[PDB]
Structure formats: structure tokens, C-alpha cells
Ligand binder design. Sequence first.
Ligand SMILES: OC[C@H]1O[C@H](O[C@@H]2[C@@H](O)[C@@H](O)O[C@H](CO)[C@H]2O)[C@H](O)[C@@H](O)[C@@H]1O
Length: 190
Amino acid sequence: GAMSGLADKVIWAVNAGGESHVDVHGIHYRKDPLEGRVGRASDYGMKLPILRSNPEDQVLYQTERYNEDSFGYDIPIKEEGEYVLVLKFAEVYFAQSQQKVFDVRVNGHTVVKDLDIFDRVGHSTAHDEIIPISIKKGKLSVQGEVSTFTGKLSVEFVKGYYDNPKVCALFIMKGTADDVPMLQPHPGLE
Ligand SMILES: OC[C@H]1O[C@H](O[C@@H]2[C@@H](O)[C@@H](O)O[C@H](CO)[C@H]2O)[C@H](O)[C@@H](O)[C@@H]1O
């Protein structure tokens, strides 16, 4: 079936950990394209199913891939509008707070410099960061800083305290954050 219209705006998505997956809404991740761009999901930490995610979008929002340090993703763009970078981060090993902090940049712009997945949600579960963007005339505007766009969007995260962001669920869509379906809890019988 097909009702939602999210897949209609998708343009590029990557979940470091699994291998080519399509979330319910219809958001597909393209197999390890930056981790040596060669190999297959090691699926070593497939265990511990994320709670805030349905079984299918679970393996996606979950799974884990390890590179080495300062991992970098490339998102070639050729259109404008409101680009919304949504990503699901999960797991990090060791139950500690304000210690395992990392850095996250968009097209070279630090938006979350203190990514402590644990302190953020707590238990494993699923973590999510929403970063709306505005590209016009070929230029880029991140939050409150202006910088022209050049070839592609680059999400680079730098090491903070060993073990770079374990689980990565990169998901980039185009045109707006409002599209992102969100059904508020409903009681009774549907
Ligand atoms: O190859 C499996 C995992 O290796 C690394 O994790 C290490 C862990 O297994 C243990 O031995 O402790 C060390 C020190 O912190 C960890 O580095 C990778 O970080 C992980 O991504 C792999 O799945």
C-alpha cells in the first residue's frame, strides 16, 4: 500500500549498521556507501531492539557500523527548498552521562556539539535530531548562519571520547519538516 507522501520527497538516506533498508513511510537507506564503500553489515549489535521503533524501522534506526574516526557522509544536491536532516542515533556502550559527548556538522556546520546519546534519552531506545535548513539561489542557511552550498551536503562527526557514534540512521528529505508524519496518541478503539 501507499498513503503517506514522505517517500515522495526523500532524496538520500543512510543507516550505518545495516544494509539497504526501506522504512515503513518508504525511506530507503543505501548500503554502506562511506565505510570503505565495500563490504556487508557486520550485524554484531543487532541485538537490543530499539523500543521507540517498529520492528522494520527498528533494524534501520538500529544496527551498527564502525569506521575509525571522523566519519563523513556526502549528499549531492541539485535542488532548493527547505531541506530537513533527520537522523536516528542509538547505542554507545557504557551507561554514563555527560562523558560520551561528540560533534556533529552539516555541510561543515556544527549543530550538535555535545552528542551524548545516553544523557539525551537514557536507555538504548531511539535518539533523534531534527535540523531544518533553507537553500535558495544555490546558497545554504543553517539555523542562524549563512554559507553558500558547494556540490553536496556533508555530515561529519568528530570523535569525542573513543568509539565514534555507534549507530547511525542518516535520513535526508527535501522541502520541509512539516511533511514528517506525526500521529498524536489516540485512545479508544480506532
Ligand atoms: O569489532 C566489534 C566492535 O569493536 C569495537 O568495540 C570495542 C568493544 O568490543 C570492546 O572490546 O571494548 C572496546 C573499548 O571501548 C571497544 O572499542 C567498535 O567500537 C564497535 O563498533 C564494534 O562493533
